[PDB]
């Protein structure tokens, strides 16, 4: 993605529960490599694991979990997405949604089921952590 900063990293793994441990390790390796407040990093790590776990639990067969970590000066943006079996993996007012909104400064979702094939099944969540 071009709007991504020069230090961004995109990770892709099979959207399988067996890969959640690898994702936690790599996200932790990146945060240590970064500059944000430590308390903000620890919260963000928990939120990214919640996002990845909910996406992979809802993932269609043979889907890919696509994770982008974009560390900027002001903030860190983390985007995760996968082809899922539901139009909304973190419903308004759900416990998951409240957890994410407590741990990240901004939480946004994206999904367009009008797109044909697997793109119409993709659900994404973007977390932003500042300062």
């Amino acid at each position: 993605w071009m709007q991504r900063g020069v230090r961004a990293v995109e990770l892709n793994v099979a959207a399988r529960l067996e890969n959640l441990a690898l994702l936690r390790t790599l996200v932790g390796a990146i945060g240590t490599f970064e500059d944000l407040d430590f308390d903000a990093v620890a919260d963000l790590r928990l939120a990214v694991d919640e996002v990845c776990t909910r996406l992979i639990r809802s993932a269609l067969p043979d889907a890919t979990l696509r994770l982008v970590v974009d560390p900027r000066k002001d903030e860190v943006v983390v985007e995760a997405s996968a082809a899922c079996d539901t139009h909304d993996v973190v419903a308004p007012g759900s416990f998951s949604w409240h957890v994410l909104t407590a741990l990240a400064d901004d939480v946004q979702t994206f999904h367009d089921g009008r797109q044909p094939d697997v793109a119409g099944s993709v659900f994404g969540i973007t977390l932003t952590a500042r300062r």
């Binding site: 430590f38 308390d39 416990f95 998951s96």
Partner: protein, 57 residues
């Protein structure tokens, strides 16, 4: 109200740490100093408790 039975079911230190984070809005470092444990131990307890609550809710 729904969370209360589930929180009482949490191990005692898990519950204290969860409530300090999500009800008192303390940072993980402030929770570490309040309970007298390490910052990493706070993150470990939060992760564990969120994983339990994730499947009951």
């Amino acid at each position: 109200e729904v969370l209360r039975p589930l929180l009482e079911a949490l191990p005692e230190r898990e519950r204290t740490v969860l409530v300090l984070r999500f009800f008192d809005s303390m940072t993980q470092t402030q929770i570490a100093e309040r309970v007298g444990i390490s910052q990493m131990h706070v993150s470990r307890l939060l992760a564990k408790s969120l994983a339990r609550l994730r499947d009951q809710l």
